[PDB]
């Protein structure tokens, strides 16, 4: 279980400017990664709006020490208002020393990331979707459950949950048909369809998939090796105005 | 449902148990003791009030009460009574 801390960027910055001068303050070597790929918003075609640039590096020498392991993953655009954001995992001094170094370098100031219901559910859609080496999209499904914590007096109803077996998830999407957003057309309406509760209006605490991710508003938790690309893209649009 | 009877019963019983615990009290004896105490208190209070009113004394104090009890109780008991009362008042003032 790895907990990810999210964080945004005010204006677009350049990070490969001085990897030689980012090390003497820290006294050990740090590598560089330059990478960009296609992020198809629509399978039929994609404009220049999905042009994304991603950076990644670490601060470590000891591979045996799995606990003292941290990664800083960057990704974002350059044409909309907010250019990019950033994410990191783990607690250490290495998670901030570079952070001050670009505190006083570029003039960008940080802010915690806010999630609400309009965004929280749609993250699991990007988590469950998969891409192969032949650019073929198939979905690996998971038995999602939701956490609800409604604020009330007398604490009459303080917490309740909804659980869906994902074979029934299979039976819902197939009934709707081939959809790229299963939670738009098979799951979320069906809860309103039967029980009459609006998931989005109600205060949602957590969306849990079966052993793949752990989504909460305060922070996202995932047991994978590294976060994917569709997740970061949907986060970027959500925090965009 | 009944307005409580104002008596000295608990204190009389406590005095008896302080003296000696073996024996007890009958209801008729209890009424007799209550009436006797009430009569003595009424006598002493009336005497103190009359004596204070005689010397156009607006208040009642320890001197007036001591004179009243000396008037009522005969001297043999009065000596012990005034001695014990003076002891009690002086020690209360000290406290």
């Amino acid at each position: 279980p790895y907990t990810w801390k999210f964080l945004g960027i005010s204006k677009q910055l350049s990070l490969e400017n001085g990897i030689a001068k980012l090390n003497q303050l820290l006294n050990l070597e740090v590598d560089l990664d330059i990478q960009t790929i296609r992020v198809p918003s629509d399978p039929d075609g994609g404009t220049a709006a999905d042009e994304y640039i991603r950076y990644e590096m670490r601060l470590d020498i000891s591979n045996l020490d799995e606990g003292t392991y941290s990664k800083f993953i960057f990704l974002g655009n350059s044409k909309m208002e907010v250019p990019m954001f950033l994410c990191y995992c783990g607690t250490d001094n290495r998670n901030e020393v570079v952070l001050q170094w670009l505190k006083a370098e570029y003039g960008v100031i940080m802010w915690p990331i806010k999630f609400e219901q309009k965004t929280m559910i749609k993250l699991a859609d990007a988590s469950i979707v998969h891409v192969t080496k032949e650019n073929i999209e198939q979905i690996t499904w998971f038995s999602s459950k939701l956490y609800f914590e409604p604020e009330t007096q007398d604490k009459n109803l303080r917490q309740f949950s909804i659980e869906i077996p994902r074979e029934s998830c299979e039976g819902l999407a197939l009934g709707y048909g081939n959809t790229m957003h299963p939670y738009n057309d098979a799951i979320v309406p069906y809860i309103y369809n039967e029980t009459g509760m609006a998931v989005e209006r109600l205060p949602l605490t957590s969306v849990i998939l079966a052993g793949h991710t752990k989504i909460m508003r305060e922070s996202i938790v995932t047991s994978t090796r590294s976060l994917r690309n569709r997740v970061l893209a949907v986060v970027l649009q959500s925090i965009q105005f | 449902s009944k307005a409580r009877k104002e008596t000295y019963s608990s204190y009389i019983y406590k005095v008896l148990k302080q003296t000696h615990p073996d024996t007890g009290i009958s209801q008729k004896s209890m009424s007799i003791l209550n009436s006797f105490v009430n009569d003595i208190f009424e006598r002493i209070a009336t005497e103190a009030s009359k004596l204070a009113a005689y010397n156009k004394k607006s208040t009642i104090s320890a001197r007036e009460i001591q004179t009243a009890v000396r008037l009522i109780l005969p001297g043999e008991l009065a000596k012990h009574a005034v001695s014990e009362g003076t002891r009690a008042v002086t020690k209360y003032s000290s406290s």
Binding site: - | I12, S26, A48, T59
Partner: protein, 97 residues
């Protein structure tokens, strides 16, 4: 901690204070009068109870009776003269000899 507890008197003190105030004996009441009167009353009650108890000892019975109360009161000549006008209910009369 009650004023009676400080005074060491079994009979209460504020009780006598409120009784004196209620009885309109004087326009203004004092402060040593209730404790003095309470002490005198306690002394008299203890004296009469002890004499009745001694009469009971001579009566070899664990129950004390108005009979024994009359014995004590009338045997003590001073107490008899103090309480000459009162009559004890079911008290009986003294033997001639």
């Amino acid at each position: 901690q009650s004023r009676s507890a400080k005074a060491g008197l079994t009979f209460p003190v504020g009780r006598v204070h409120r009784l004196l105030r209620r009885g309109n004996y004087a326009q203004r009441i004092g402060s040593g009068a209730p404790v003095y009167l309470t002490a005198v009353l306690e002394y008299l009650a203890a004296e009469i109870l002890e004499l009745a108890g001694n009469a009971a000892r001579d009566n070899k019975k664990t129950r004390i009776i108005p009979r024994h109360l009359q014995l004590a009161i009338r045997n003590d000549d001073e107490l008899n003269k103090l309480l000459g006008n009162v009559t004890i209910a079911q008290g009986g009369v003294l033997p001639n000899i």
